[PDB]
Design a protein around this ligand. Structure first.
Ligand SMILES: C[S@@+](CC[C@H](N)C(=O)[O-])C[C@H]1O[C@@H](n2cnc3c(N)ncnc32)[C@H](O)[C@@H]1O
Ligand SMILES: OC[C@@]1(O)OC[C@@H](O)[C@@H](O)[C@@H]1O
Ligand SMILES: [Cl-]
Length: 259
């Protein structure tokens, strides 16, 4: 009597490599990253978003699902995609990004995109072990995938326990790696009651992950959101019209900001 999400995961893990590669992009929204990738390889530091993450966060911001403002803390900042984007938003006054260093983990990329001077990224900073800090906006994009959904479940619950102390009177956008397991749904219901917001599927996410984001603005039934996302993902395995929808990548400009 598994959840629809569990049914999706078992089916995903049964795909061949070619099937997986076709499925992951079927009918998704996608930014053309060729130009940014080539530029970044050449050491270019203006205009380019450092990752696909900038476009993901832009989608939420454009729809007023999160409204970054004041002091922004970005947990699991990686290369800095979310941080460099927030740096260009009018209401943002400072951005601090923290990420885990080490082999196999992405390190921050120094960039000169608009508002770069308001951003301080720091590697070698495992957020599970640091004290929470006051901020006006809390972003978190942590959650490592695994073919084992119980491992993802444990990762998601650990992230949720970790972020809660950082939430008080502030905007937020937090990745929920595995939102479909019963303990996670229940945890999310409790945290939504305590801190508000809603759970949303980003159309730029690949079909190979069931990730959803808990955003501070709006409200909605979490069980419905999760189940409708699971149904969509299950239905995409045998999608008749699977062409992705392409959008231009984000241009983050250049120059310092004065607040
Ligand atoms: C998907 S990425 C971030 C993408 C980012 N939002 C962007 O737009 O470029 C998640 C990052 O969180 C980092 N991470 C994982 N566990 C962490 C921890 N305990 N503390 C800090 N960072 C962590 C990973 O190394 C990875 O770089
Ligand atoms: O509502 C916020 C809070 O009180 O929730 C319970 C724990 O997570 C605390 O660390 C956290 O500050
Ligand atoms: Cl609803």
């Amino acid at each position: 009597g598994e959840t629809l999400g569990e049914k999706w995961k078992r089916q995903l893990n049964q795909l061949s490599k070619s099937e997986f590669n076709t499925y992951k992009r079927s009918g998704i929204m996608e930014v053309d990253r060729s130009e940014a990738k080539e530029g970044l390889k050449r050491g270019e530091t203006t205009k380019h978003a450092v990752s696909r993450g900038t476009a993901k966060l832009r989608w939420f911001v454009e729809r007023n699902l999160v409204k970054p403002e004041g002091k922004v803390i970005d947990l699991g900042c990686g290369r800095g995609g979310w941080s460099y984007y927030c740096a260009g938003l009018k209401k943002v006054t400072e951005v601090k990004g923290y990420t885990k260093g080490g082999p196999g983990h992405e390190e921050p990329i120094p960039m000169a995109t608009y508002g770069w001077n308001l951003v301080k990224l720091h590697s070698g900073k495992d957020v599970f072990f640091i004290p929470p800090e006051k901020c006006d906006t809390l972003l978190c994009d942590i959650g490592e995938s695994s073919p084992n959904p119980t491992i993802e479940e444990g990762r998601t619950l650990r992230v949720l326990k970790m972020v809660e102390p950082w939430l008080r009177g502030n905007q937020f956008c937090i990745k929920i790696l595995n939102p479909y397991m019963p303990s996670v749904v229940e945890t999310l219901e409790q945290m939504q009651r305590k801190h508000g917001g809603m759970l949303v599927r980003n159309p730029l996410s690949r079909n190979s992950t069931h990730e959803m984001y808990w955003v501070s603005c709006g409200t909605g039934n979490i069980v419905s959101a999760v189940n409708m996302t699971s149904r969509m993902l299950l239905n995409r395995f045998t999608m008749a019209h699977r062409k992705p929808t392409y959008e231009r990548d984000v241009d983050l400009g250049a120059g310092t900001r004065h607040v």
